[PDB]
């Protein structure tokens with residue numbers, strides 16, 4: 001039993017809700033919140049920009065030190081950093097950005113990072129400003145993640161379309 005509330009159950013391990021991931025994280029304070037990161041951990045917009053703003057830019061400061069030490073992530077890769085005031089940990093995961101020409105096949109590799117954590121709060125990878133089809137992203141999530149994932153979908157219209165079209 002966990003403190004996630006109001007989710008629709010899609011499968012044995014995947015749950016979905018129309019919610020702002022920032023507000024969800026502040027309420028639940030989960031062990032792991034997933035960020036829709038880029039390889040440089042530049043948290044300028046979308047989910048990443050919103051999460052960073054909620055940390056008063058502490059996420060960006062930590063991220064800049066991480067990159068200075070380690071260099072950029074791989075597309076499809078991830079790193080674990082602090083969750084600041086939002087969660088214990090933040091799993092920064094890089095899904096392919098279709099608006100940069102990146103291979104959508106890497107979306108499965110991106111979701112595989114979730115399997116290293118027993119429970120996560122997460123957005124749909126590569127959705128929003130990353131330019132991928134969110135229905136497809138949900139399909140890959142369900143077919144790849146085996147741990148317990150609680151998906152927050154910000155757009156209410158998009159949430160209803162994902163539920164109604166789910167197979």
Ligand SMILES: CC1(C)CC[C@H](CO)N(c2ncnc3[nH]ccc23)C1
Pocket residue numbers: 019020021022046047050122123124125127128129134152153154155158
């Ligand atoms: C374009 C979106 C409405 C759809 C998919 C992603 C990840 O779920 N989106 C978010 N989902 C949940 N919380 C969020 N906060 C800021 C953006 C955001 C944007």
